[PDB]
Amino acid sequence: SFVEMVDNLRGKSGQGYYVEMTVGSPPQTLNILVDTGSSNFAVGAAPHPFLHRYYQRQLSSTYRDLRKGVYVPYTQGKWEGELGTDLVSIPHGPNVTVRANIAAITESDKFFINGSNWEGILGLAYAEIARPDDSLEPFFDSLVKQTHVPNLFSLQLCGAASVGGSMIIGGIDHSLYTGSLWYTPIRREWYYEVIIVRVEINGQDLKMDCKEYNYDKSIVDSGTTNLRLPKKVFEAAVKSIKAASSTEKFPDGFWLGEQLVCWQAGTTPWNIFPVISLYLMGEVTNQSFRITILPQQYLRPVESQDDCYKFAISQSSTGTVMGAVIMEGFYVVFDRARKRIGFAVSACHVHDEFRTAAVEGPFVTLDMEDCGYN
Ligand SMILES: CN1CC(N)=N[C@](C)(c2cccc(NC(=O)c3ccc(Cl)cn3)c2)C1=O
């Protein structure tokens, strides 16, 4: 289908998947972190110790200055920059060129990560969470308006010694998944917000009130490594995961994500660790489906003679974040036109001979609308 875009993502393990883009005329080439959990297109536009290249506005004949500052504080870090527009391309994407808003980052703190090899961020979420407000049109919105690129993109993030993946823009490559695509509704267009209606650890129901799972929201976020869970849910989950994997004991530096666990060679005993399943609201009334990941997703290799891992499930005060530990099991279709998100078993996901990630349905589920926090 879209062979031109397959494998257009790279990254360093635990640093973020970026795509190559060009900004300006003549085109200045940059690496840009793909982030479905934000909605500003912002790039380094002044020297920084962790930047090697950066957007030089004065060298672009198509640069237009909006003459307005943007200040973006995160939990951390933060940056500030200057709003402007310019022509923008994605070389291993659709062969088009669009004019888009760009926040030129001129000062930052604890934002740019050394070794990450990305010089900017492409926020693919919606205008409502854009800075400085929702009147600043996000990149993907501009792309779709100025082109015949359909209003949909799909990400395959691979485990899988450098990470790789594909961002297919405007459609769905059937070679990137197996089995069926199952769709959950986007509850509201800001984050890519979804509703989780059941959680299992090795088939055992976490057995919480379902709105705990989405307190105060659940989102699909390529800009986050971990599966992050609301405090209550997180405690119930690690307790369950601890019980399930009890044949082996681990320092609780481990369950906090501080400490590593290690094993010889390919001696990692995947089978003692439980699978984790989230049920997502389906497109049909009282119908859900479930996605299931392996320890190969939630145990992240840290790079000898031994294999070592960090525990990548962690707690959150801002609701569920389905970051890369989730996404790396699946081909994820962000179907903006139909206001829904699709998941299929990923053709590149890491697993062993006996287990694989799963997408399965349907399951009869009642009162699913009630699982959403207001
Ligand atoms: C809290 N938050 C989350 C999010 N989605 N977006 C940003 C704006 C953000 C800022 C800077 C870096 C990153 N991501 C990473 O560095 C990253 C992403 C994915 C992996 Cl697999 C690894 N690293 C995200 C945020 O502030």
Sign of the Cα torsion 127, 131, 136, 141 reads negative
- Looking at the domain assignment, is residue 117 inside a domain? yes
Nearest protein CA to atom 14 of ligand 1, as residue? 223
Residue 175: give the domain boundaries: 150-374
CB atoms within 10 A of CB 289: 23
Q: How was this structure determined?
A: X-ray
240 close to ligand 1 (CB < 6 Angstrom): no
Q: Report d(CA 210, CA 130) in Å as an integer.
A: 29
For ligand 1, the distance from its centroid to the CA atom of residue 223, given in whole angstroms, is 4
The resolution of the experimental structure, rounded to one decimal in Å, is 2.2
Q: Report d(CA 10, CA 2) in Å as an integer.
A: 18
Q: Report d(CA 132, CA 118) in Å as an integer.
A: 23
- Looking at the domain assignment, is residue 7 inside a domain? no
Both tokens of residue 329?
A: 């099991």
Quick one: which atom of ligand 1 is closest to the CA of 35?
5
Q: Please, which residues have CB within 8 angstroms of residue 3's CB and are 6 or more apart in sequence?
A: none
Q: How many domains does the chain have?
A: 2
328 close to ligand 1 (CB < 6 Angstrom): no
Q: In this structure, are 43 and 125 located in the same domain?
A: yes
Nearest protein CA to atom 10 of ligand 1, as residue? 111
| Residue pair 114/124 in contact by the 8 Å Cβ criterion | no
Q: Report d(CA 346, CA 112) in Å as an integer.
A: 30
Q: Report d(CA 291, CA 325) in Å as an integer.
A: 12
Q: In this structure, are 117 and 230 located in the same domain?
A: no
Known active-site residue 35: yes
Q: In this structure, are 77 and 176 located in the same domain?
A: no
37 close to ligand 1 (CB < 6 Angstrom): yes
CB atoms within 10 A of CB 354: 8
Known active-site residue 221: yes
Q: In this structure, are 366 and 248 located in the same domain?
A: yes
Q: In this structure, are 118 and 174 located in the same domain?
A: no
What residue has token string 């359909």?
A: 150
Quick one: which atom of ligand 1 is closest to the CA of 222?
19
Instruction: For the chain, give the secondary structure using H, E and C.
Output: CCCCCCCCEEECCCCCCEEEEEECCCCEEEEEEEECCCCCEEEECCCCCCCCCCCCHHHCCCCEEEEEEEEEECCCCEEEEEEEEEEEECCCCCCCEEEEEEEEEEEEECCCCCCCCCCEEEECCCHHHCCCCCCCCCHHHHHHHCCCCCCCEEEEEECCCCEEEEEEECCCCHHHEEEEEEEEECCCECCEEECEEEEEECCEECCCCHHHCCCCCEEECCCCCCEEEEHHHHHHHHHHHHHHCCCCCCCCCCCCCCCCEEEECCCCCHHHCCCEEEEEECCCCCEEEEEEECHHHHEEEECCCEEEEEECEEEECCCEEECHHHHCCEEEEEECCCCEEEEEEECCCCCCCCCCCEEEEEEECCCHHHHCCC
Q: In this structure, are 66 and 133 located in the same domain?
A: yes
Q: Report d(CA 217, CA 329) in Å as an integer.
A: 21
Both tokens of residue 53?
A: 């290249």
Nearest protein CA to atom 4 of ligand 1, as residue? 223
Instruction: For 281-296, give the secondary structure using H, E and C.
Output: ECCCCCEEEEEEECHH
CB atoms within 10 A of CB 115: 7
For ligand 1, the distance from its centroid to the CA atom of residue 24, given in whole angstroms, is 25
For ligand 1, the distance from its centroid to the CA atom of residue 226, given in whole angstroms, is 10
For ligand 1, the distance from its centroid to the CA atom of residue 284, given in whole angstroms, is 33
Rg of the chain (C-alpha set)? 21
- Looking at the domain assignment, is residue 188 inside a domain? yes
Q: In this structure, are 145 and 180 located in the same domain?
A: no
225 close to ligand 1 (CB < 6 Angstrom): yes
Q: Report d(CA 197, CA 364) in Å as an integer.
A: 11
Edge-to-edge strands, sheet with 276-281: 204-205, 196-201, 276-281, 287-293, 358-364
| Residue pair 196/213 in contact by the 8 Å Cβ criterion | yes
Q: Which of 149, 165, 185 is the last residue of a domain?
A: 149
221 close to ligand 1 (CB < 6 Angstrom): yes
Pocket probe mutation, ligand 1, options 70, 74, 163, 314, max atoms within 8 Å of Cβ: 74
- Looking at the domain assignment, is residue 81 inside a domain? yes
Q: Which of 134, 149, 164 is the last residue of a domain?
A: 149
Nearest protein CA to atom 26 of ligand 1, as residue? 74
Residue 70 β-bridge partners = 81
